[PDB]
Design an enzyme around this catalytic site. Structure first.
Site, PDB file in Angstrom:
ATOM      1  N   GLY A  45       0.824   0.466   4.545  1.00  0.00           N
ATOM      2  CA  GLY A  45      -0.703   0.988   4.517  1.00  0.00           C
ATOM      3  C   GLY A  45      -1.195   0.057   3.654  1.00  0.00           C
ATOM      4  O   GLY A  45      -0.941  -0.985   3.069  1.00  0.00           O
ATOM      5  N   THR A  46      -2.703   0.597   3.388  1.00  0.00           N
ATOM      6  CA  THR A  46      -3.745  -0.014   2.757  1.00  0.00           C
ATOM      7  C   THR A  46      -3.391  -0.176   1.041  1.00  0.00           C
ATOM      8  O   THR A  46      -2.355   0.241   0.785  1.00  0.00           O
ATOM      9  CB  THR A  46      -5.195   0.891   2.603  1.00  0.00           C
ATOM     10  OG1 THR A  46      -6.006   0.676   3.838  1.00  0.00           O
ATOM     11  CG2 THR A  46      -5.896   0.709   1.366  1.00  0.00           C
ATOM     12  N   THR A  47      -4.058  -1.412   0.710  1.00  0.00           N
ATOM     13  CA  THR A  47      -3.570  -1.518  -0.583  1.00  0.00           C
ATOM     14  C   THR A  47      -4.593  -0.751  -1.760  1.00  0.00           C
ATOM     15  O   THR A  47      -5.652  -0.737  -1.446  1.00  0.00           O
ATOM     16  CB  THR A  47      -3.653  -3.075  -1.015  1.00  0.00           C
ATOM     17  OG1 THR A  47      -4.129  -3.473  -2.600  1.00  0.00           O
ATOM     18  CG2 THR A  47      -4.522  -3.960   0.010  1.00  0.00           C
ATOM     19  N   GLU A  52      -8.718   0.021  -1.031  1.00  0.00           N
ATOM     20  CA  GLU A  52      -9.306  -0.524   0.336  1.00  0.00           C
ATOM     21  C   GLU A  52      -9.213   0.627   1.372  1.00  0.00           C
ATOM     22  O   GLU A  52      -8.560   1.218   1.687  1.00  0.00           O
ATOM     23  CB  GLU A  52      -8.420  -1.862   0.551  1.00  0.00           C
ATOM     24  CG  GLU A  52      -8.471  -2.475   2.060  1.00  0.00           C
ATOM     25  CD  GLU A  52      -7.378  -3.321   2.648  1.00  0.00           C
ATOM     26  OE1 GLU A  52      -7.516  -3.983   3.383  1.00  0.00           O
ATOM     27  OE2 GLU A  52      -6.362  -3.144   1.812  1.00  0.00           O
TER      28      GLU A  52
END
Lengths: 198, 250, 233, 244, 241, 244, 242, 243, 111
Positions: free
Chosen positions: D30-32, D47
């Protein structure tokens, strides 16, 4: 209250039970049969609180008829009265107790002897030569204590009952519209359709 | 969540065996040896205190437990299972007997309760049988002294003398050569110490051996006085010393 | 691989996937196409109804949740009934207890949370339906995309179902245009009906085959079927 | 044998719980997102990948508030992240109801920890597919935390997780080394905007939208608030400028 | 708390546990029923794998649900008890609330429902039983014969059989029962019933019990002799040819 | 989930058989044999103790014959522990009946009830059946002396003479050979011993490996009596019958 | 094994799919809707000549304005019928009016997916889906005469004509050609009787087939054999006329 | 056939793999701990390893305060370690409430050991991959060390050690007691006992320790407390002036 | 002891014409001898051309109206926006009222 009489003679048990059904100011019915047949040789009369009365009787009837089919046998009057007492004794400590008093009269085909059981709503059972519930006993027990004999015939028993019924019709406040008499013996249960003048 | 294991984990195999019961018994076999001998005036149960580290204190770990003042137990197999079995056993003795008849249950009866607990672990949902075999020795007024063995299946039998665990076979034999219906308690304590020596490899003394008996009443162990009918517990655990004294005459 | 990790929703694949959820997502794409798009005054839903025989009806795909909210479905009809019905209560609750119309964004959070619960516990099963929610609340026009994975996203427009990719591109292209179709309902619907037809292939949208819903500034959520959609075909 | 990785509460021969390890794979995917503990508060940033133009800008908020003083951000399965926050919110309500004082960050941390850990005890539930960075200000200081699917969690000076977790961590360590006395609330916000931009390289294909929030004793009165408008644009520039 | 779905659909649209329940019936002793013009008769074969029993007490194959209705079965005995009890209880309950004993269709429909319920409830398996329920509706004289099976399906028959070799005995009945003219006699009706059981019992005077049910709760079971007498007269009809 | 470990104890085989019941029967077939012989004036119960040792206490023993009522007793074949669970509930059913009807529980009603309980573990619950087979010996004033049998399936039947456990095929044959309707208790007491003596898997049939019981109506009274022979009584009768 | 309410990789519910396979093996049932009423017919299909054909109840009344036919595992329909009848009666008690045929159908369909070993959504206690399909036919003031097909999937469609069972794809093909928005009740009766005769193994007669209809005037009635016997004869004649 | 390795049911050999594997999990943190008893105190030592520079070293601990008197050090993953600590704290609180006195070290141990035994028998509960060492200065038994494992086993110790290099620490300590001939550390001040612990810990691990490589817990009459980096540093210096 | 009821007074009147119907009620709401409001609407439009008033104990009247309005709302949802005839609304209200047969809504309601 209603009239519930029962007398055990030599070879049978006779049950006399008032026919009136009064609600308040009116006698709604004058031909009520306050009795249920639990099995071919066992009869039960009852009196008490309006709804509870028939409800409890029919409930017991259903159970004994279920037992009969399951076992293809008929319970002894003693076994039945013990089952009936146990039921009442449960109800007595429940949320809404059955306020019903009963007389169980049956002919034990195994000992070939008639039997009469008296059980009040608390689950108080006792076997007697004769019994009654409510105010009935107050006028009838002295008559039976006097004229009762263990060898009486069904015929003498019916006369003795007639005596009781007349006394009840003279001193009791309520007009219970006569009784319905039934006889339990070695040949099952039969009704004396002619007691209105026997 | 919620235990979704409502079904049995111990079932019948085509051959008719109950796998988990078998395996539990296999677990008992790996267990340290323990035994029980019945004399005419007492019973003795004993086992080996296999220390799992010299730093550990073996007194803090009892294999011989008192269930009631006249009943004691010992086992072979999985120690933790035994421990919890003992708690439950002590408790059922009260709830199913003392709290009702005002007296401790007779040996056979408590055994029956224990056996019940184990039987259930054989059929209830989502559990495994207990990995132990017990030896319960006790005494009651109308049955006298008795010795019982309870297996993972929940079965139990009365013994004159028997052994369970590792060298059970070797010791069951030795006991048959030294047992007679006239042994006094001290005699059985002796026979016991001997039977246990063949099972122990290393140090064999009062600190590597745990032994208790069901004998006469111990008024000095009652803790109070004033009630004639309360004469003390019949269960007594021998002290490290009491053992060594007897080991000299071994 | 997959075969050993798709037995149920409570199992993670070695790569970190939830196959049962992925399979549910597939029932969506195999469903009929529907589109969503909104301006600043209205939000519209357009859907293509599918039928069995020529003797069967065209299964509806638009459900009203309250006077200011509604949605279109793609996938298992039953699951949309269950979800819309749950949304109907949440809306009803907000009204009765707080005398407040439920925020579209919140209806989305509610849906997401309800879906998520069926993807973490044993025995359940992900919902096999995709939903497009539109509404007008205290913050204007709204459009939401609901995925059984539990993912809900607020957009200006979008579509789901078979070939839904066409309309979705058209809208992504027409964006600057329709987003300014304020105060003019008839136009926003046409923009939607052109976005929808960008996913046709089999047939052409007919009268008893097209379905359109709208809500907005001064328009209670209302659905149009049959002759009522005739003027847009 | 094998099949140790098919049920949740099962131990593998090496003492691991593979299913929890697989949940991690979903998190790394997943997104950071990150957290920067500052001298009197904490800053959170994430993000937000822009799938397309159709996404309404600034409308799909990911950062969540717990009570009034706690902030939570997470990478992985978003729905699982919410489920965990919902629980966090109840856990907080319950604590405040009985003890009056709002729940201390450390205490809140353990509540989440136990709940997550609980989902690794039975095979009838699935572990959480998220890592979570949360924190705030309480009776004594600021606290930053990161909670793994295994239920493990620790306090951090700075923390990151997601697709570009390493780029992020690299940047964070530099900050810790180059600011021994402490960072400021104002500073951490910009810094955060930068780390997010940098860590975006490991996903430089899709365009993204930035999201910051903070909790500072002096700057927000110890209350969690989202960074919007000027302060947000100021940090966007500070980053856009240092990415070149 | 055990609710595992044991009865489920297989790829071909079958529910194997119900089907396997039927196999348990195929393995049960044979049972037949034929309705005359004023009666119904139920016959049941008795195994012989083990003989040295006490017939006085050993549970018989036919059971009275109520004084006017009886029920026979093929399959797992233990299972049939659970069904008989429920049927009996329902019989009394129906009398208590409707103030009239149950009709045969009603009792059958109830038993079938119970059977069906066990085919789609978690944690339980279907009844490995198939039944024949016969008798006379209250105050009615038209005979009734019904059959139920593991699936929960039921229907009435002019005559029918279930159990091992029911396949054979049904053939006999199909080409031996003329709906046009049903056994207008209790006697010839029992004959027809024994005749069909002989096609499969292979000489078994003590392996064939029979019960006759007539209108108004008139049910009675024949004794070995009375049955063996029918066996005798039938073996002659054969040799006299 | 857990479904992975569910043995499904209550399902049919493609043949229409109950796996667990069958396997449970296989188990029974290895237990000490038990015989039941019903005479005109009484009943006999004989059982062979499976496995024994010199040290096994036989006086304080009871692993096959148990008193249920004052008029009923049972012979056990299989898991003793399972048997007790059943026995205890049967002892309770007997008393409830007595308390309800003020009459002793007719033999068949007690047997049917116990069989119904076994039947239950066959159709629902997912628990293993009881690995037990019983021989019931009792008396009531409707059928007099009765003898019944019940196995794991929940099925039960009445007999004149019968056996359960090991070598029942051999045993049933011998009984079926020397049994006669007019027999007298003592005749049966011998038939019981002879039969065991010929089917035993042991060298000799000594007293220490047996349990004996009779339910007679000692004429000098008019009531029914249950006698559970003591070791010494068995040793005697074992000599009288000419087995020394 | 595998969850009873599990998804296939194609996005379908295994149990529901297999459920349908069981329906394909059922006895044929057909329904035709005209502006004069709806007609329902079924293939009795007795498994042996000793089975008394009229004890085969595959056409049942829900309320006076609603009737229905089944196909597949018929025993599974009993409780669905019960639920349906109750819903109808109950709706009337609460609102003093008739339940809409579509509403009645929706209610029945709600029971459809209430199966599984523990699906997190309510308390769906039922081990498997139903193995039967239903043709619900009735009339109400709002939408007049209607015919519905309710499946174990939980969805239902409204049909002008529809067949379910073993001879469904076949009969449906026929119905596609025969049905027109102006059939009369008489035409429909014959048309059902005719198409049944085509797909049945047995030679259709007034004993292995049964008819019925629902008309706003006399409600739902099941045609007794004598009435059907003539409709069968009347059909044999119109076919023998060309 | 092959699932007797996934749930806690016997294997043909009579073993419980899940319990053995849970034991494996206790070494996952590659940390070592050890406890010793003073004259009137108990000291626990546990390696502290903070690899990440981003971590807040102060929140990284495996030592816990269960009650005003009991301390517990854990060998195993932190999530199970905390699950255990919480349950223990609760158990200790409740015990005081119901019986009117502080729960003894050994009793809490037995309790936790019993709880663990249950995960050993009931299939739905998994064992906890941890080993719990409880310490205190009990009012009846004096300095105490009781340790429980995933098997549900527990026992008291004169001293003990747990971890990957547990064996070297144990034999080291064993040898020292074979010498002193007493089952404890003959010292009045806990400061020295703490030093003995750090010392003999080093000798056996063959590693030097800086104030942040250790974690120390001390139990004294009526109180259990943990040391700070600084309290430790002060301890580290004292040992430095002897070697 | 707590008494769950009160009396807010007021009065309502309903007369039906041949092709119309009226439902009126004063707007005064009181408690004992005080006035709580000189204008508190007591007759409502519940949709589908149905006006309703539940006079007596205000809190009970409000709860009932509220519930019935919600009734109409779900009637539409569950039965394809069908219009709730007034005789149907009447029967529905009977169930709403009898539902609290043992803890009555202290109101005389008219529609």
């Amino acid at each position: 209250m209603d009239i519930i009489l029962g007398i055990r003679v030599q070879d049978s048990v006779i049950l006399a039970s008032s026919k009136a059904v009064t609600r308040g100011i009116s006698v709604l019915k004058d031909s009520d049969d306050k009795t249920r047949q639990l099995s071919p040789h066992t009869l039960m009369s009852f009196a008490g609180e309006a709804g509870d009365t028939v409800q409890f009787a029919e409930y017991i009837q259903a159970n004994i008829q279920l037992y009969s089919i399951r076992e293809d046998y008929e319970l002894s009057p003693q076994a039945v009265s013990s089952f009936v007492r146990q039921e009442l004794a449960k109800s007595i400590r429940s949320r809404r107790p059955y306020q019903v008093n009963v007389l169980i009269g049956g002919y034990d085909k195994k000992k070939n002897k008639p039997e009469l059981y008296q059980i009040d709503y608390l689950g108080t059972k006792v076997e007697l030569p004769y019994g009654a519930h409510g105010y009935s006993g107050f006028y009838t027990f002295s008559l039976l204590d006097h004229h009762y004999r263990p060898d009486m015939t069904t015929e003498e028993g019916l006369d003795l009952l007639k005596l009781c019924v007349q006394e009840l019709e003279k001193r009791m406040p309520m007009d219970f519209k006569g009784v319905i008499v039934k006889i339990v013996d070695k040949d099952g249960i039969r009704q004396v359709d002619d007691f209105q003048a026997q | 969540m919620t235990d979704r294991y409502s079904f049995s984990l111990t079932t019948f195999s085509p051959s008719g065996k109950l796998g988990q019961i078998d395996y539990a018994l296999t677990a008992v076999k790996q267990g340290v040896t323990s035994l029980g001998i019945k004399a005419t005036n007492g019973v003795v149960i004993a086992t080996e205190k296999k220390s799992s580290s010299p730093l550990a204190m073996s007194e803090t770990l009892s294999k011989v437990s008192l269930l009631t003042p006249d009943i004691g137990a010992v086992y072979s197999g999985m120690g933790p299972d035994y421990r919890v079995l003992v708690d439950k056993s002590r408790k059922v003795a009260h709830t199913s007997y003392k709290r009702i008849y005002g007296e401790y249950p007779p040996t056979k009866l408590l055994v029956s309760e224990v056996a019940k607990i184990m039987q259930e672990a054989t059929q209830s949902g989502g559990v495994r049988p207990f990995g132990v075999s017990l030896l319960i020795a006790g005494h009651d007024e109308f049955n006298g002294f008795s010795l019982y063995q309870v297996d993972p299946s929940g079965s139990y039998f009365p013994w004159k003398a028997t052994a369970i665990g590792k060298g059970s076979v070797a010791a069951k034999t030795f006991l048959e050569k030294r047992w007679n219906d006239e042994l006094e308690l001290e005699d059985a304590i002796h026979i016991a110490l001997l039977t246990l020596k063949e099972s122990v490899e290393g140090e064999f003394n009062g600190d590597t051996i745990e032994l208790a008996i069901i004998g006469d009443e111990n008024p000095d162990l009652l803790g109070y006085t004033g009630i004639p009918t309360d004469k003390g517990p019949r269960f007594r655990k021998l002290t490290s010393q009491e053992i060594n004294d007897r080991l000299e005459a071994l | 691989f997959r075969n050993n990790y798709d037995g149920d929703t409570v199992t993670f694949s070695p790569t970190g996937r939830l196959f049962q959820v992925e399979y549910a997502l597939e029932a969506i794409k195999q469903g009929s196409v529907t589109v969503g798009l909104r301006s600043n005054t209205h939000a519209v839903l357009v859907a293509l109804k599918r039928n069995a025989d020529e003797l069967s009806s065209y299964q509806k795909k638009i459900i009203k949740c309250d006077e200011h909210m509604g949605l279109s479905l793609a996938g298992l009809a039953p699951d949309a009934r269950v979800l819309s019905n749950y949304l109907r209560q949440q809306c009803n609750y907000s009204s009765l207890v707080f005398n407040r119309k439920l925020a579209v964004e919140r209806a989305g959070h509610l849906l997401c949370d309800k879906a998520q619960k069926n993807t973490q516990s044993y025995g359940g099963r992900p919902y096999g339906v995709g939903l497009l929610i539109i509404g007008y609340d205290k913050s204007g026009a709204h459009l939401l995309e609901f995925q059984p994975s539990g993912n809900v996203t607020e957009l200006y427009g979008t579509a789901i179902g078979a070939r839904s990719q066409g309309a979705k591109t058209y809208l992504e292209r027409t964006l600057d245009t329709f987003i300014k179709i304020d105060g003019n309902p008839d136009e926003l619907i046409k923009a939607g009906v052109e976005a929808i037809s960008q996913s046709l292939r089999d047939e052409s949208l007919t009268v008893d085959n097209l379905s359109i819903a709208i809500v907005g500034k001064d328009t209670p959520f209302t659905i149009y079927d049959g002759e009522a959609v005739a003027k847009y075909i | 044998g094998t099949g140790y990785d098919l049920s949740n509460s099962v131990f593998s021969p090496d003492g691991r719980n593979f299913q929890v390890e697989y949940a991690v794979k979903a998190v790394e995917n997943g997104t950071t997102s990150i957290g920067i503990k500052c001298n009197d508060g904490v800053v959170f940033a994430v993000e937000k990948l822009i799938t397309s133009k159709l996404l309404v800008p600034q409308k799909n908020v990911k950062i969540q508030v717990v009570d009034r003083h706690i902030g939570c951000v997470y990478s992985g399965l978003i729905p699982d992240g919410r489920h965990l926050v919902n629980r966090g919110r109840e856990e907080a309500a319950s604590f405040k109801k009985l003890y009056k004082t709002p729940i201390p960050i450390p205490a809140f941390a353990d509540r989440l920890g136990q709940y997550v850990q609980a989902h690794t005890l039975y095979n009838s539930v699935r572990p959480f597919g998220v890592s979570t960075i949360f924190g705030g200000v309480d009776k004594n200081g600021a606290h930053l935390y990161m909670l793994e699917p295994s239920g493990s969690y620790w306090g951090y000076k700075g923390a990151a997780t997601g697709k570009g977790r390493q780029s992020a961590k690299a940047e964070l360590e530099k900050l810790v080394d180059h600011h021994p006395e402490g960072l400021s609330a104002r500073e951490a916000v910009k810094q955060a905007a930068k780390i997010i931009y940098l860590a975006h390289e490991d996903n430089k294909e899709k365009d993204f939208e930035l999201e910051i929030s903070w909790c500072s004793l002096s700057e927000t009165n110890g209350l969690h608030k989202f960074v919007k408008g000027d302060l947000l644009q100021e940090a966007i520039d500070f980053a856009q400028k240092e990415i070149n | 708390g055990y609710d595992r779905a044991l009865s489920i659909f297989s790829p071909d649209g079958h529910i194997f546990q119900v089907e396997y329940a039927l196999e348990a019936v195929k393995r049960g002793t044979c049972a037949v029923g034929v309705k005359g013009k004023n009666c119904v008769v139920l016959g049941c074969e008795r195994r012989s794998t083990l003989k040295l029993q006490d017939t006085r007490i050993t549970p018989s194959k036919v059971s009275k649900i109520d004084s006017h209705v009886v029920l026979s079965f093929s399959g797992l005995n233990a299972d049939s008890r659970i069904l008989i009890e429920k049927a009996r209880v329902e019989a009394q309950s129906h009398r208590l609330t409707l103030e009239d004993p149950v009709t045969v269709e009603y009792l059958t429909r109830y038993v079938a429902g119970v059977q069906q319920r066990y085919t789609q409830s978690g944690g339980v398996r279907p009844f490995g039983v198939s039944t024949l329920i016969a008798g006379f509706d209250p105050r009615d004289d038209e005979p009734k014969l019904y059959q139920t099976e593991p699936s929960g399906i039921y229907s009435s028959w002019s005559a029918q059989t279930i159990g091992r070799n029911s396949k054979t005995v049904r053939e006999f009945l199909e080409k031996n029962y003329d709906r046009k003219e049903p056994p207008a006699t209790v006697e010839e009706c029992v004959k027809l019933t024994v005749r069909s059981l002989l096609e499969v019992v292979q000489t078994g005077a003590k392996n064939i019990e029979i019960t006759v049910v007539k209108p108004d709760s008139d049910i009675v079971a024949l004794s070995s002799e009375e049955i063996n007498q029918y066996v005798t007269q039938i073996e002659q009809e054969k040799q006299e040819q | 989930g857990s479904r992975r470990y569910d043995s499904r104890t209550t399902i049919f085989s493609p043949e229409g058989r109950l796996y667990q019941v069958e396997y449970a029967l296989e188990s029974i077939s290895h237990a000490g044999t038990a015989i039941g012989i019903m005479a005109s004036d009484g009943i006999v119960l004989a059982a062979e103790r499976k496995v024994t040792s010199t040290l096994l206490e036989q006086d304080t023993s009871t692993e096959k014959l148990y008193k249920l009522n004052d008029k009923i007793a049972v012979a056990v074949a299989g898991l003793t522990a399972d048997a007790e669970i059943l026995i205890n509930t049967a002892r309770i059913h007997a008393q409830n009946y007595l308390k309800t009807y003020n009459e002793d529980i007719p033999v068949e009603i007690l047997v049917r009830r116990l069989s119904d309980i076994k039947q239950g573990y066959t159709q629902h619950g997912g628990l293993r059946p009881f690995g037990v087979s019983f021989i019931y010996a009792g008396y009531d004033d409707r059928y007099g002396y009765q003898l019944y049998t019940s196995n794991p399936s929940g099925n039960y039947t009445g007999w004149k003479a019968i056996s359960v456990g090991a070598n029942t095929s051999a045993a049933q044959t011998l009984l079926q050979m020397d049994y006669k309707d007019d027999m007298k208790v003592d005749d049966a007491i011998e038939l019981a011993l002879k039969t065991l003596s010929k089917t035993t898997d042991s060298s000799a049939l000594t007293y220490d490996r047996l349990e004996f019981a009779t339910i007679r109506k000692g004429a000098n009274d008019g009531e029914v009596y249950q006698k559970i022979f003591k070791p010494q009584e068995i040793k005697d009768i074992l000599v009288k019958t000419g087995i020394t | 094994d595998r969850g009873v309410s599990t998804f296939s990789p194609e996005g379908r519910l295994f149990q529901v799919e297999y459920s349908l396979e069981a329906i394909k093996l059922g006895s044929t049932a057909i329904g035709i809707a005209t502006k004069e009423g709806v007609v329902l017919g079924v293939e009795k299909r007795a498994t042996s000549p000793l089975l008394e054909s009229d004890s085969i109840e595959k056409i049942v009344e829900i309320d006076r304005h609603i009737g229905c036919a089944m196909s597949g595992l018929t025993a599974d329909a009993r409780s669905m019928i019960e639920h349906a009848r109750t819903a109808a009666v109950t709706h009337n008690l609460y609102y003093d009016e008739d339940i809409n045929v579509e509403s009645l159908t929706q209610s029945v369909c709600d029971l459809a997916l209430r199966f599984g070993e523990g699906a997190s959504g309510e308390e769906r206690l039922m081990s498997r889906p139903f193995g039967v399909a239903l043709l619900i036919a009735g009339h109400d003031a709002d939408d007049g005469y209607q015919l519905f097909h309710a499946e174990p999937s939980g969805t239902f469609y409204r049909y002008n004509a529809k067949a379910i069972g073993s001879g469904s794809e076949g009969a449906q093909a026929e119905l596609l050609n025969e049905w027109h928005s102006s059939l009369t009740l008489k035409e429909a009766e014959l048309l059902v009787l005719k198409i049944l005769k085509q797909v049945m193994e047995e030679k259709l007669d007034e004993n292995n087939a049964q008819l019925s209809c629902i008309t706003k005037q006399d409600g739902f009635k099941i045609y007794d054999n004598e009435k059907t016997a003539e409709l069968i004869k009347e059909l044999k004649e119109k076919e023998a006329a060309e | 056939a092959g699932y007797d390795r996934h749930i806690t049911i016997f294997s043909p050999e009579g073993r419980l793999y899940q319990v053995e594997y849970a034991f494996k999990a206790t070494n996952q943190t590659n940390i070592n701990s050890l406890a010793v008893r003073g004259k009137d105190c108990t000291v626990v030592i546990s390696q502290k390893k903070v690899p990440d520079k981003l971590l807040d070293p102060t929140t990284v601990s495996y030592i816990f305060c269960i009650s005003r008197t009991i301390g517990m050090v854990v060998n195993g993953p932190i999530p199970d370690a905390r699950n255990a600590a919480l349950r223990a704290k609760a158990e200790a609180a409740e015990f005081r409430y119901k019986y009117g006195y502080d729960m003894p070290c050994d009793v809490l141990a037995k309790r936790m050991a019993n709880l663990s035994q249950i995960y050993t028998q009931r299939a739905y509960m998994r064992p906890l991959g941890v080993i719990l060492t409880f310490v205190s200065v009990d009012e009846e038994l004096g300095p105490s060390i009781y340790k429980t494992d995933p098997a549900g086993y527990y026992v008291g110790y004169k001293a003990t050690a747990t971890g990957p290099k547990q064996q070297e620490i144990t034999t080291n300590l064993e040898n020292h007691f074979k010498k002193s001939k007493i089952d404890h550390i003959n010292e009045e001040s806990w400061e020295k006992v703490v030093e003995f612990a750090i010392t003999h810990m080093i000798d056996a691990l063959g590693t030097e320790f800086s104030k942040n490589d250790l974690e120390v817990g001390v139990a004294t009459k009526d109180k259990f407390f943990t040391l700070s980096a600084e309290n430790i540093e002060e301890r580290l210096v004292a040992i430095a002036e002897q070697d | 002891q707590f008494n769950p009821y009160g009396d807010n007074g007021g009065t309502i009147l309903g007369i039906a014409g041949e092709d119309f119907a009226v439902l009126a009620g004063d707007t005064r709401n009181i408690t004992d001898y005080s006035i709580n409001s000189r204008y508190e609407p007591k007759v409502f439009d519940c949709g589908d051309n149905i006006v309703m008033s539940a006079n007596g104990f205000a809190a009970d009247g409000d709860a009932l109206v509220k519930r019935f309005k919600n009734s109409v709302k779900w009637y539409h949802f569950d039965h394809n926006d069908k219009k709730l005839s007034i005789n149907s609304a009447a029967r529905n209200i009977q169930h709403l009222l009898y539902g609290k047969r043992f803890f009555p809504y202290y109101v005389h309601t008219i529609i």
